[PDB]
Amino acid sequence: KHLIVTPSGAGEQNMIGMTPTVIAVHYLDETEQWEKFGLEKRQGALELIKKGYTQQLAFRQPSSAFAAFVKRAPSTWLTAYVVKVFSLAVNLIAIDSQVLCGAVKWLILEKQKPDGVFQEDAPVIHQEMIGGLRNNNEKDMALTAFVLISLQEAKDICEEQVNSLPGSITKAGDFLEANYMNLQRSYTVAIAGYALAQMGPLLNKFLTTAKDKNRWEDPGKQLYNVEATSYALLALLQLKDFDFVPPVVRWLNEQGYGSTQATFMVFQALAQYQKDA
């Protein structure tokens, strides 16, 4: 009931207030709790989601990418970020598929290295809005898992309008697979895991990296693990291994500023759960 925030500000700051509002409604839709949340609130929420969308289109550069300011250099992460929030909202409000495919098409033709590595040339000013991907270490594996995961949440939407999308998917997915075994941060393993699970030894790696077999935590900011454990939770559901899911989910339940990613991922994980199991 706190996740309903009225979006405003520039390209990035508008998404920070839009994110909670979009996932809030998302969750309530999948778990169908609107009756328990407030049955009359859903509209005012959608209206707000409609406002943020629009307020965001204004920060859409000619090349279909995004940034805080029209004058600012486009950002690979934000562009990718807009993509996933928006791909999730095609069931909440009106979304121009041209905008989503336009942004996905850019994220490939000019942000994916010749070897399936998506790169960030113009970082977002609000580094806190990007969850654990902020952790410099293992940036290529991480930022590539993030973009990919978005492109996956945008497949159905732009699968018929983007030619490169499928080739970009495979060329990306391998990079993570070729270097999956060489990962020490649960986060990168947790995020890229879901990344891969979306398409043997790797899979055994995805488990034994989980402390206590119920959380992908790493020696730092807990919020990062919340995110980490979430991507991973979605990883499980992709393989329907509802076997070890109970713990993970149980640990999440027993778990503002800088909470953009966790708020998004956590509720999306706990959502895809209520749906898949």
Partner: protein, 58 residues
């Protein structure tokens, strides 16, 4: 074009049913129509918006 008919079959059921489920299905159908300048697109989007404003789905 199938996608408009689909979107049509989705919006009609939503107008009658008026639920959170039918709404998700109707909005996505319309969004799936990739031709933005289609008029059956804006028209069908209108019916969506009209139910949301005067109704409480589900």
């Amino acid at each position: 074009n199938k996608k408009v008919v689909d979107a049509q079959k989705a919006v009609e059921l939503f107008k009658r049913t008026r639920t959170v489920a039918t709404h998700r299905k109707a909005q996505r159908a319309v969004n799936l129509i990739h031709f933005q300048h289609s008029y059956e697109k804006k028209k069908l989007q209108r019916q969506i918006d009209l139910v949301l404003k005067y109704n409480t789905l589900k």
